[PDB]
Amino acid sequence: SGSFWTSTQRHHWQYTKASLAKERQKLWLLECQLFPQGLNIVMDKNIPITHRDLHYDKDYNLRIYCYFLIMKLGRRLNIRQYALATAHIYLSRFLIKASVREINLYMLVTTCVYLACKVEECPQYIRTLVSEARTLWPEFIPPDPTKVTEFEFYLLEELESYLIVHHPYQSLKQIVQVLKQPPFQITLSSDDLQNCWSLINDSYINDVHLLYPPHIIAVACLFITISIHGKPPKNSSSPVQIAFNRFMAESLVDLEEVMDTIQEQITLYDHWDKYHEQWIKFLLHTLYLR
Amino acid sequence: LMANNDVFTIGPYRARKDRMRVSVLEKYEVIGYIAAGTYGKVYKAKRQIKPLTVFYAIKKFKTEKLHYTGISQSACREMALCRELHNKHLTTLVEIFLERKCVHMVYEYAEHDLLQIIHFHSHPEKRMIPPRMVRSIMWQLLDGVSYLHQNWVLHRDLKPANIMVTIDGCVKIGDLGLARKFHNMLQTLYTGDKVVVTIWYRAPELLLGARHYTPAVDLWSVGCIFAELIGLQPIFKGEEAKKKTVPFQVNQLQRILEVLGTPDQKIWPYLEKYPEYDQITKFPKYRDNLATWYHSAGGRDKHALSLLYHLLNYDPIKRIDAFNALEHKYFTESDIPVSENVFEGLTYKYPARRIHT
Amino acid sequence: GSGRYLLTPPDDLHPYVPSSKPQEQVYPDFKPWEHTAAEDQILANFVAKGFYHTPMVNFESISARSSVHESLVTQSNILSQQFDKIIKIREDHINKIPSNSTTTLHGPGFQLPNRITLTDHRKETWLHELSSSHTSLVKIGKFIPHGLKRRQVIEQCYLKFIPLKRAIWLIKCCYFIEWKSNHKKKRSNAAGADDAISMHLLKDWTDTFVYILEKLIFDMTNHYNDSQQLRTWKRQISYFLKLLGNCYSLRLINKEIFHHWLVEFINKMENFEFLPLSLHILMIFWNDICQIDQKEPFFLVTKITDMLLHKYYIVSSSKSMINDENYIINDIKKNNKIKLNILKILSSLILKIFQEQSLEVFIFPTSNWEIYKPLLFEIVSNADTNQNSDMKKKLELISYRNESFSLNLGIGIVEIAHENEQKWLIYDKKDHKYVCTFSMEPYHFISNYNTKYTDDMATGSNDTTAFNDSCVNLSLFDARFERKNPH
Amino acid sequence: ASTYRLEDVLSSFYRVEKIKKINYHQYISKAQNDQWSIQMEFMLRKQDPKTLVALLSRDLWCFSINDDPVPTPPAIEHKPVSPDKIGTFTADYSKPNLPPHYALFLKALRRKIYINLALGSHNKLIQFGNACISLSGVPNYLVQLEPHLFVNGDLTVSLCAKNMGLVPMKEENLEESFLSKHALYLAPSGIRMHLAPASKQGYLITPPKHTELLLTTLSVSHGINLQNKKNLKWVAVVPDLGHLNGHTPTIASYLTPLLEAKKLVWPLHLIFAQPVADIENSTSGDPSEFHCLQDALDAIDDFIQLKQSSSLPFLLRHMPLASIPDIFITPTPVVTISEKEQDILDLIAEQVVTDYNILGNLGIPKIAYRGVKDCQEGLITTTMLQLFSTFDRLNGNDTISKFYNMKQPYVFVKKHHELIKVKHDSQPFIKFLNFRPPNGIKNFKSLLLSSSFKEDCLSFAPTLSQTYINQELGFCELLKLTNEDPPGLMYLKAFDKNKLLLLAAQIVSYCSNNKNSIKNVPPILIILPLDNATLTELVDKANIFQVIKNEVCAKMPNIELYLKVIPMDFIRNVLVTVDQYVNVAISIYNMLPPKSVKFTHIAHTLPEKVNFRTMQQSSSIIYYDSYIHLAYSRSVDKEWVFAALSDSYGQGSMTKTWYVGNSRGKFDDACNQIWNIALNLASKKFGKICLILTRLNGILPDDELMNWRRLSGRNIHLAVVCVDDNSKISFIDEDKLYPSFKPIYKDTRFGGRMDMTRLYDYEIRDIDQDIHGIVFQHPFPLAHSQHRCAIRSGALIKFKKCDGDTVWDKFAVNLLNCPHSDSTQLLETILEEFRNLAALNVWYGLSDGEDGHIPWHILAVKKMMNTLVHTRVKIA
């Protein structure tokens, strides 16, 4: 959090919604002529084939599994949250410009954790890294670390040297610093501070970080936490809520982006229900280990 | 059930990428190998198409000095920092190009370095540098290190080799070799680097093995730069050193003592908390000869003396940061103005770089 | 210095707390490195150990799925209502321009350009300063002298060739400053003595306007001996007619005294060398004199046709010269050439009178039935029988002669109901009803130049008092500011 | 506070029956009978005129109301004929496209009503085809009875009164002065015809003995049998076969004869005429040139000088009165185009579609349906109460479901250097607030080009350039040549080829002089004064500008000049305020080459209710993100196609016109290009995007529907909408209490109170831009085209600024094809977008403050198809 304005994140990525839709359409027209065949899925022989868009594209169903597998490798290796967040940012910025039906996902996850841990000054050697990626997944990863580091080379090639990225956690620390002032004089309980930190940790899914500044995401998760803590006669009682409403109004952090972030959190927690490991894990198994 | 080195991996995505690329034989072309970096070679790049001749530079990080060694920390931190940092006083990173094996950065080519200025003044005619040029270069370098300081990124490399100048006299501190962003240190500095900036320009915190060195080590390096530029010799031209993970530089501490004098608990408040403070107790007890050493130079007294007092102080609480050093009775009080162009009135070309063709 | 430093400022960014003292407010997502006390305390107490900060909240890196479980069904409407309250507070307090004035329906600010006690030297040069076409607007609008009589204002306006918009601005400014002064010096405020002052002022300015027009039209024959003065006089009458029309269409002239003066002025003249210009002045307002849709109603129409028939008779009587005092009075050919033109003009005007009025009351109480109109109506239309039958009914009336089987549809179609002429009303947003007609007199809408907003925005906080200055308060349109933290 | 008394606002729907069942027999035209159906229909009607019967071309359809059985026709002495299909239906049919028994029951009911109404009257009223015009000139308008059946079984009739100029003609009109400039019509059918040339008798002949049998047939259909009349004048007619098949002739050049089929005889008592509406320059302002002040200075200079079975297709078919135009003007000028060059028509549409009323609506005013107040007294109430069960009109509370007042949308404007929102009712204060456009400036250089009166355009051009500079709208550094001409002017005379060539050479020499400059500094435009605000000189000034551009472009490309027209009166009327030129200045600012960025657009504010979209309820509801509005129209004659395309905030505006002509390949080309431009704008937004194409003037025929069903797909979701401007359905308002401008307009002292200026939070709310939205309870029939009703009808309604009972202006929207379910939500969203697109139309120079209820692209299409169909085209 040096200065997000006049950084590289505000300039050469973080495009608007129409530009992201146009780039996704260019990705779709790129993968159109690649394989019009589809996928030969077999279990009971049984061989139906999807259309190019029934699923296993970048809409929703595998992103939760992607975040779960990144976090599993993270807490297995026991590295801090900023490295896994930067690895998830590299994951999304690579899958925007390349498909997933041609790239081994587990090596991409281990490669992104490797590159983010190296660039955010908390290094992990390649021996223990590929040994953990083998001891958690005994398949889908070669013993050669050279293939992992050639993946590292092409990952550095694709996201063209834009490695460092500001995080919403620093702006959350700044907001909870400024909320201890004589204009407001409030402070959350430590369980709701952990709830807001967990919501920020959960919002790295669902494709929001490529559109808005991170302080808007921090304000959105803190608003969801405060307005979901306040109610569990008068309507807007518990004046922590009142001081937060006056803070969000009197400061000119704008609306209509926080609305989209809250609606995106609602649709993420809606899409979490119809999610199962079985179909996507079997689809990966029949997409790589045929 | 186990995997081998033949499973489905990145392979197809190579092909879709490898048809359309751009090479170093296409956008630019080579001219001549200038031997600057032994670990990573530097070349000169003619633009491939009043005369506007070759003014580019390539660094080609071929670390093998085979099959795909990964990126190093000294290359990863440089590629992370140089691409987004941008100022008038930094080398502008134009492009990264990733060849069959390694990385090729292209910056702008510079006219000369400060070491070439000292070597031009190393002929025994002894053209002592005029104080206007050295104070303007000092102002510009301090503004560059101010921009590098305030954006939360250290700079543990400051030598007269990798500080450049150009036509129109613009100082560019052009090497982010060992910089790091110190906002959220997940692992502390002593657990990540364990050694620092080169022997002739390190700090007494680093010489005494501090494990949480503050951002004032660049100011000590800048003061050593200025003492070098005022004496035409490196101020502590130190002697290199040989289960302890440090060689301690047991002669460099003797040099920096006998030039500046001993510390105690009154010019240094917490040196007792150091790991090997007792290892400083095995030297003699010199007073100083700082004013005498400035007296054995040109006669521009009473204002460089106070600045060299303040910069060369091993009290890392009371050292002087950049924006509070850019007003220290040297640039406000003037007899000829400190400009951006440092080559006004001085009308000679310090000759061009030695290009091994 | 030579080049500006790197202080790393923000660009145009709203801080998290604008109420705070202006040098210790943290900008959003913005933190430069600064030397302070806790940093040196960390450096002092944390050598030989290594410093790194473990995070604040325990149990990081965990999804909030079993932590906030039912955030969809039971708990969405509370979020919607709370964000609705935040949106309403924002739009109603932070951005809406407050009208902090309880006197009149202008914005705060909007002072009239201040009168200065000026003598004739600086005023004499200032009127020449207005007369150019390259001068500024703010510096001229910052001051205006006082004591300017209306004769002198209109006189130097049509004499020094002031452009039209600046002349309308000067006349409206004199109107407004005289109205405000005369409304200041009022001792008694009874029902009727605080409204008739405007009608008094309007009648007075109509009087001096028709006085200056009469003065110029007589100055024509009181000066005409030099063709360089005539070439000036032609653009003089053209410019004054342009200015008179531009003031007459803006309701700055009482239209019913001016028309009565006009019919008196065409009736009273006796020398024919003013007729072709005065008849053109009549033809200009012809669309408003004879288009009124003893008797008060349609009085100018009957007065204008009696006057025009009398002028037709007096023109058709004799020769064009009235002085007969100088020698070589008349050569006959130019005389008949001049007279045929005036006869043609009056013939066409009487023709449009007879085409226009459907009431057709030409009862002549003064001179009973002298005949010239059949000689007119034989010429046009080649004996169209409608005008002929109307002329026979005319000779019956005005000459004072001495003594469906079952087609009932019943469908009852509607008729066009005339709408009134006040578009602008006022909504009372408290009781939710319309209340009154917004109508300022047309000497209120002046393009205001004497402002004081040449400074920068965000000067302190809530400096809308020097922003809302115009000749309408901005809160009569719900003028919302727009300000966001940009991305 | 919408405390509107929903009872006692009178509609135009008279309820006449109550239907829970309706039965029908269809007799097919089996085995190609010897006109058996055509004979037996009139043989069935001769028994009683109360029967319900109709006929497709040879198929027979007999109908029967709720209880009574259907009649059987008088067959042969032995009966072999059985009905082909029996059936019944109810008041819930297939609504978005009518099945072909309801569209026959409506025709049978309308024919029964007109025949009974003609027989009950004293033989003085015939069916003109969806009309009943008297033979005498007593009403001098068309009364139109339109039956309809609602969805709950309420058989109503709607009354209309079209004020067309249909005047009956007689023997003392068969001369050149009447037949030269009238359009004739055959009365009980509705076909148009011209009189055959005479037979040395004087345009009337004696009837042959055969065709008098036709008069006997007029006792059985249309009930006007004048067999008892001792005088009867016969004439020889010939109709146009194209108008027998819907193809009305070219409305640009009417009154022109065409090939014949065969002669016919017809009684002169029933042949009607339509008069050619005429156009003149002006009045009241001396068109004989004494309003010219230089005439007065000339006269004072002279004083200074002196000081020293051949008729059954005409007795069976009918025309639905939409295939006859309302007006057609006399002079009818000619424009010329190529087979690839469509430039002059787009030029005239560009410079007539965005001028306020300064052009003046140069043609003839409109012929609209005047609203019926009541019908209690006369004869049609007696005939309906004799024919049917009841006759009384529907109140407001039976048809109107949702009545609510719309909001006031905001707009962007730049005050000093802030960018503030403001209410859209603040256009004429745009000078007295120093408002300036948010989207930056556009710059040009001007050149007035007059030939009539130099002494007034010399005073007009610098003050227009000064009022364009004096508001921050760019720099109009007006043009300057070498010689003595005052800048930005060229007083020519006799606008012709050689002088335009020399002027083009002068301008190209100027452009060769000013070589090195930026691209955006030089767009230039030419202002031409119309000497007469009509069409015949607008097309000629367009021709003059096209000749100038043709002679400039071939000598130098990349120069881009434009055309602006201004009437001469607006230059030389001395009553034109300088508070008015401002509007004219904005009408240059919407023509400069950044064309689709205009003065202002809708503010895009925060919503009123947030309503986070969770789990649905999970039906096929969509909740779209960005709509796209499009309005296309096609003229009555089938040549012209007009189109206008706009964003949901009025951003990406396009206005275009295509002269298709008689063919049908250019029509498919234009209907493909409309979708091309629509998808070109659609490839700019988020996704889940629903384009809404609105067909003007009621009728949506089958060929355009085939085209839009072929072109559409899964690329975008369409939603067809039928739009009606003229009040054919006429709700007449009758109350004194709700709209609170009526107590202030009644006596100007009822409310009349002080503002109480300590409660000072008010807003100046300009009436004529306070629209009220209505969503009806049941679908409505379209005002034309009896082949398709609607679903979920609604309306925008604007009151009249007056006191008392009068009709209110309305704009009827009719949804025809919704993409998802819950069409009422889509209709309310369409109305909430249409109110914003209606409020935008004053800031764009499309019209003055006369219709705040019509959205701007539909008003643009209406102005184009009102003032551009009259020019006739030749292809060279």
C-alpha to C-alpha distance for D816 and D717, rounded to whole angstroms? 14
Within 8 A of B69 by CB-CB distance, chain A residues are 149
Is A156 near chain C, with CB under 8 Å? no
C-alpha to C-alpha distance for C101 and C473, rounded to whole angstroms? 9
D634 bridge partner residues:
D641
Spatial CA neighbour of B112 closest among B99, B121, B125, B124: B121
Give the technique used to solve this structure: cryo-EM
Same domain as C208, residue C172: yes
Per-state percent for chain C, helix, strand, coil, to nearest 5: 45, 5, 50
Q: Are strands D654-659 and D640-647 parallel, antiparallel or unpaired?
A: antiparallel
Across the interface, whether the CB atoms of C64 and A248 are under 8 A apart is answered no
Instruction: Name the token pair of C105.
Output: 């329906």
Within 8 A of A121 by CB-CB distance, chain B residues are 180-181, 185-187, 192
Q: Which long-range contacts (CB under 8 A, 24 or more apart) does A34-41 make?
A: A34/A99, A34/A102, A35/A101, A39/A283, A39/A286, A39/A287, A40/A286, A40/A290, A41/A282, A41/A283, A41/A286
Within 8 A of D467 by CB-CB distance, chain C residues are 165
Q: Are strands B103-108 and B56-61 parallel, antiparallel or unpaired?
A: antiparallel
Burial C250-288 (b: 16+ CB within 10 A, else e): bebbbeeebbebbbebbeeeeebbbbbbbbbbbbbbbee
Domain A17-164+275-288 in CATH 1.10.472.10: yes
> Could you tell me the residue ranges of all domains in chain A?
17-164+275-288, 168-271
**3-state SS record for chain B:** CCCCCCCCCCHHHHHHHHCCCCCCCCCEEEEEEECCCCCCEEEEEEECCCCCCCCEEEEEECCCCCCCCCCCHHHHHHHHHCCCCCCCCCCCCCEEEECCCCEEEEEECCCEEHHHHHHHCCCCCCCCCCHHHHHHHHHHHHHHHHHHHHCCCCCCCCCCCCCEECCCCCCECCCCCCCCCCCCCCCCCCCCCCCCCCHHHCCHHHHCCCCCCCCCHHHHHHHHHHHHHHHCCCCCCCCCCCCCCCCCCCCHHHHHHHHHCCCCCCCCCCHHHCCCHHHHCCCCCCCCCHHHHHHCCCCCCCCHHHHHHHHCCCCCCCCCCCCCCCCCCCCCCCCCCCCCCCCCCCCCCCCCCCCEC
Within 8 A of B16 by CB-CB distance, chain A residues are 102
> Could you tell me the residue ranges of all domains in chain D?
13-165+370-393, 167-279+312-316, 335-363+440-596, 400-409+625-870
**DSSP, residue by residue, C295-357:** -STTHHHHHHHHHHHHHHHHHHHS-S-S---SSS---HHHHHHHHHHHHHHHHHHHHHHHHH-
Burial of B290 (0-12, 13-18, 19+ CB in 10 A): middle
Nearest to A266 among C13, C72, C81 (CB): C72
Burial A77-93 (b: 16+ CB within 10 A, else e): bebbbbbbbbbbbbbbb
C-alpha to C-alpha distance for D649 and D597, rounded to whole angstroms? 12
Instruction: Name the token pair of D546.
Output: 């096209």
**3-state SS record for D33-83:** CCCHHHHHHHHHHCCCCCCEEEECCCCEEEEECCCCCCCCCCCCCCCCCCC
The answer to whether C379 and C347 have CB atoms below 8 angstroms apart is yes
Within 8 A of C40 by CB-CB distance, chain B residues are 214, 317
CA B215 centroid distance within chain: 14
Q: What residues make up the domain containing B264?
A: 110-357
Distances (CA, A) of C363 to C298, C305, C400: 13, 11, 9
Nearest to C16 among A166, A178, A199 (CB): A178
C-alpha to C-alpha distance for D699 and D712, rounded to whole angstroms? 20
Inside any domain, residue C326: no
Instruction: Name the token pair of B192.
Output: 């990540």
Helical residues (DSSP H) of D470-496, grouped into ranges: none
Name the neighbours of B, counting chains with at least 3 Cβ pairs within 8 A.
A, C
Coil/strand/helix, residue D341: coil
Q: Which amino acid is located at A71 in the chain? A: M
D148 bridge partner residues:
D156
Spatial CA neighbour of D851 closest among D806, D815, D800: D800
Calculate how close chain C gets to D313, using CA atoms only, in Å.
30
Across the interface, whether the CB atoms of A143 and B69 are under 8 A apart is answered no
Spatial CA neighbour of D626 closest among D643, D604, D600: D604
Angle CA D488–D494–D497, to nearest 5: 90
Chains B and C touch (3+ CB pairs under 8 A): yes
Coil/strand/helix, residue C467: coil
Inside any domain, residue C453: no
Q: What residues make up the domain containing C212?
A: 112-185+193-253
Instruction: Name the token pair of C191.
Output: 């029902």
The answer to whether C465 and C100 have CB atoms below 8 angstroms apart is yes
The neighbour count for residue D344, using CB atoms within 10 Å, is 19
Across the interface, whether the CB atoms of B71 and A146 are under 8 A apart is answered no
**DSSP, residue by residue, A27-57:** HHHHHHTT-SS--------------TTSSSS
Across the interface, whether the CB atoms of B12 and A98 are under 8 A apart is answered no
The answer to whether B338 and B331 have CB atoms below 8 angstroms apart is yes
The neighbour count for residue C241, using CB atoms within 10 Å, is 19
C-alpha to C-alpha distance for B131 and B129, rounded to whole angstroms? 6
C-alpha to C-alpha distance for D56 and D607, rounded to whole angstroms? 54
C-alpha to C-alpha distance for D357 and D848, rounded to whole angstroms? 6
Active-site positions of B read 157
How big is chain B, counted in residues? Answer: 357
Q: Which long-range contacts (CB under 8 A, 24 or more apart) does D101-106 make?
A: D101/D24, D101/D26, D101/D61, D102/D149, D103/D786, D103/D787, D104/D54, D104/D56, D104/D61, D104/D63, D105/D22, D105/D24, D105/D52, D105/D54, D105/D63, D105/D149, D106/D147, D106/D148, D106/D149, D106/D786
The neighbour count for residue C46, using CB atoms within 10 Å, is 17
Helix orientation angle between B217-231 and B131-150, rounded to the nearest 10 degrees:
170
Angle CA D40–D16–D56, to nearest 5: 30
Within 8 A of A18 by CB-CB distance, chain D residues are 684-686
Q: Are strands D689-695 and D717-718 parallel, antiparallel or unpaired?
A: parallel
Within 8 A of C29 by CB-CB distance, chain B residues are none
**DSSP-derived secondary structure letter, C444:** S
Domain covering D400-409+625-870 in this structure, CATH number = 3.30.420
Place of tokens 């697109």: D837
Nearest chain A Cα to C62, which residue? A198
Distances (CA, A) of A213 to A14, A216, B184, D646: 8, 6, 19, 32
C-alpha to C-alpha distance for D641 and D634, rounded to whole angstroms? 5
**DSSP, residue by residue, D227-272:** SS-S---EEEEEE-HHHHTT----TTS-S-----S--EEEETTSEE
Which positions of B make up the binding site for ATP? 34-42, 59
Mutate to test the interface with C, among A82, A197, A217, A268 (most CBs of C within 10 A): A197
Q: Do domains A17-164+275-288 and A168-271 have the same CATH topology?
A: yes
Instruction: Name the token pair of D528.
Output: 């031409």
Across the interface, whether the CB atoms of A18 and D686 are under 8 A apart is answered yes
Phi/psi for D702 (5° steps) reads: -90, -25
C-alpha to C-alpha distance for D603 and D610, rounded to whole angstroms? 18
How big is chain D, counted in residues? Answer: 876
Distances (CA, A) of A219 to A13, A253, A255: 22, 9, 10
Burial of B125 (0-12, 13-18, 19+ CB in 10 A): exposed
Spatial CA neighbour of D432 closest among C422, C463, C106, C437: C106
Of C359, C380, C399, which residue sits at a domain end?
C399
B108 bridge partner residues:
B56
Instruction: Name the token pair of D298.
Output: 């000339």
Calculate how close chain B gets to A90, using CA atoms only, in Å.
14
C-alpha to C-alpha distance for D130 and D322, rounded to whole angstroms? 10
C-alpha to C-alpha distance for A108 and A151, rounded to whole angstroms? 7
Across the interface, whether the CB atoms of C15 and A270 are under 8 A apart is answered no
Coil/strand/helix, residue A205: coil
Coil/strand/helix, residue C160: helix
Distances (CA, A) of D25 to C485, D53, D65, D107, D387: 73, 10, 12, 15, 22
Phi/psi for D483 (5° steps) reads: -80, -170
Instruction: Name the token pair of D163.
Output: 């004020």
Fold of A168-271: Cyclin A; domain 1 (1.10.472)
How big is chain C, counted in residues? Answer: 487
Q: Which amino acid is located at A134 in the chain? A: R
B259 bridge partner residues:
none
What is the Cβ-side half-sphere exposure of residue D776, based on CA atoms within 13 angstroms?
A: 26
The answer to whether D473 and D441 have CB atoms below 8 angstroms apart is yes
Nearest chain D Cα to C408, which residue? D378
Phi/psi for B23 (5° steps) reads: -110, 170
Phi/psi for D839 (5° steps) reads: -70, -20
Q: Which amino acid is located at D222 in the chain? A: H
**Roughly how many angstroms between the first and final C-alpha of chain D, as a whole number?**
63
Within 8 A of B79 by CB-CB distance, chain A residues are 156, 161, 163
Spatial CA neighbour of D237 closest among D265, D274, D214: D265
Is D577 near chain C, with CB under 8 Å? yes
C-alpha to C-alpha distance for C200 and D474, rounded to whole angstroms? 43
The answer to whether C158 and C239 have CB atoms below 8 angstroms apart is yes
**DSSP-derived secondary structure letter, C90:** I
Inside any domain, residue C57: no
C-alpha to C-alpha distance for B260 and D352, rounded to whole angstroms? 89
Inside any domain, residue C364: yes
C-alpha to C-alpha distance for D74 and D40, rounded to whole angstroms? 8
Across the interface, whether the CB atoms of C436 and D755 are under 8 A apart is answered yes
Nearest to C31 among A174, A262, A266 (CB): A174
**DSSP-derived secondary structure letter, C97:** P
Which positions of B make up the binding site? 34-42, 59
Spatial CA neighbour of D808 closest among D738, D737, D727, D747: D727
Chain A residues 205-264 within an 8 A CB cutoff of chain C: 212-215, 223-224, 227-228, 231, 235-236, 241, 245-255, 257-259, 262
Nearest chain C Cα to A256, which residue? C87
Burial of D841 (0-12, 13-18, 19+ CB in 10 A): buried
How big is chain A, counted in residues? Answer: 290
Question: Does the CA dihedral C171-C177-C183-C185 come out positive or negative?
Answer: negative
Contact partners, residue D475, CB within 8 Å, separation at least 6: D441, D443, D469
Across the interface, whether the CB atoms of B210 and C52 are under 8 A apart is answered no
Place of tokens 């000369």: B112
Across the interface, whether the CB atoms of D612 and A266 are under 8 A apart is answered yes
C-alpha to C-alpha distance for D703 and B37, rounded to whole angstroms? 77
Spatial CA neighbour of A150 closest among D96, B101, D545: B101
**3-state SS record for D409-459:** CEEEEECCCCEEEEECCCCCCCCCCCCECCCCCCCEEEEECCCCCHHHHHH
Give the helix/strand (H/E) hosting D217.
Answer: helix D213-217
Distances (CA, A) of C423 to D433, D770, D801: 19, 11, 8
Instruction: Name the token pair of B196.
Output: 């620092």
Nearest to B70 among A3, A98, A152 (CB): A152
Chains B and D touch (3+ CB pairs under 8 A): no
Burial of B34 (0-12, 13-18, 19+ CB in 10 A): middle
C-alpha to C-alpha distance for A5 and A16, rounded to whole angstroms? 16
Helical residues (DSSP H) of C64-163, grouped into ranges: 77-89, 120-130, 138-141, 150-160
Fold of D335-363+440-596: Rossmann fold (3.40.50)
Calculate how close chain A gets to D611, using CA atoms only, in Å.
10
CA D258 centroid distance within chain: 28
Name the neighbours of A, counting chains with at least 3 Cβ pairs within 8 A.
B, C, D
Inside any domain, residue C105: no
Q: Which amino acid is located at D412 in the chain? A: F
The answer to whether C61 and A86 have CB atoms below 8 angstroms apart is no
Phi/psi for D149 (5° steps) reads: -120, 125
Within 8 A of D145 by CB-CB distance, chain C residues are none
Across the interface, whether the CB atoms of A254 and C61 are under 8 A apart is answered no
Spatial CA neighbour of D348 closest among D559, D530, D585, D541: D541
Greatest pairwise CA separation for chain A in angstroms: 72
Q: Which long-range contacts (CB under 8 A, 24 or more apart) does C52-58 make?
A: C52/B185, C52/B186, C52/B187, C52/B188, C53/B184, C53/B185, C55/A80, C55/A81, C55/A169, C56/A173, C56/A193, C57/A190, C57/A193, C57/A194, C57/A197, C58/A194
Chain A residues 76-105 within an 8 A CB cutoff of chain B: 80, 82-83, 98, 102-104
Contact partners, residue A233, CB within 8 Å, separation at least 6: none
Across the interface, whether the CB atoms of D764 and C477 are under 8 A apart is answered yes
Nearest chain D Cα to C104, which residue? D757
CA C220 centroid distance within chain: 32
Give Rg (Cα) of chain A.
21
